[model samples]
Target: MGPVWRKHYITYRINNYTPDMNREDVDYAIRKAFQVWSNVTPLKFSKINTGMADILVVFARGAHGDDHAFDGKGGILAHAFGPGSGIGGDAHFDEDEFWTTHSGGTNLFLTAVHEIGHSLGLGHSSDPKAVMFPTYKYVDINTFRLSADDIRGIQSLYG
Candidate 1:
């Protein structure tokens, strides 16, 4: 409740890029991930060309200097902080996995969407269908939409 962003608009910086993906694809993935949430709530997001931003997205490997260092390839794929400033709204993806646009590897779009949920103050949902679920499951990115549970959960806070 209190952790929710006080402003309706937010800006994010892509602090680090994934080597597995090209610049355009990574930016596109991050854009769509934010779109998933923005579609159902009043919250809006923009990109920062320079300096600090409210949220920072990074792709890193084992022990990337954060307290929550990524564990190799299969263990923890990524993590994010709940809404706030500085590191509070940051999301870190594990570079150990072959991140891709599809399910052929760890899908960047899906994982980014889930982490964005955390960045917006969402906690894990018991409903496996929800994007906020702790585990990663891939769906066709082109056909992806927020589950009813996911919308309701976020709307409860940001609606």
Candidate 2:
């Protein structure tokens, strides 16, 4: 087992939205995902309009600026950096995927939650029932929430 990534309260800003989806939908999903962690621990997040934030959430395609470039699609849908200095805690989503709020596409809310877990320095869980599980599953919005393992992980870091 590993300790949750701990740090002072941080802010995040979404520089841009994926052209394929509604901006409000993306923003709402991302914020809701962050709230899941905030509610469980002392960690807090604020949204900013400009300048750099502790976490820079963005959507990109193959070989984005970062070293862990996405492989277009079907391989790695997204990735995030662990806690550190610059560029740390940032999350990038693969634009190649059909990201959407409903079925017939990648569930934005579910994926956002999973990616944020990584951004917070949480790794994939071996348990399929865990939210941190590596593989993506199409989760229904009305019925989705963080797993007990996830809550425990964050609590271990902040409490």
Whose TM-score is greatest here? 1
Worst 10 residues of 2 by lDDT: 1-10
TM-score each candidate. Answer: 0.96, 0.92
The C-alpha RMSD in Å for every predicted model, in order, reads 1.0, 1.7
**What root-mean-square deviation over C-alphas does model 1 reach?**
1.0
Residues 1-159, candidate 1, lDDT per residue (tens digit)?
649888989999998788898999999999999998999999889999799899999888888886777889897889999888789999999999999988788999999999999988888888878888889999878888888989988998886
lDDT of each: 0.90, 0.81
The TM-score obtained by model 1 is 0.96
Write down the TM-score for model 2.
0.92
Residue 50 accuracy (lDDT) in model 1: 93
Model 2 residue 76 CA deviation (Å) reads 0.9
Candidate 2 lDDT tens digits, 17-81: 98878889889989998987888878888988898798899899998887777887687888888
| Stretches of model 2 off by over 4 angstroms after superposition | 1-8
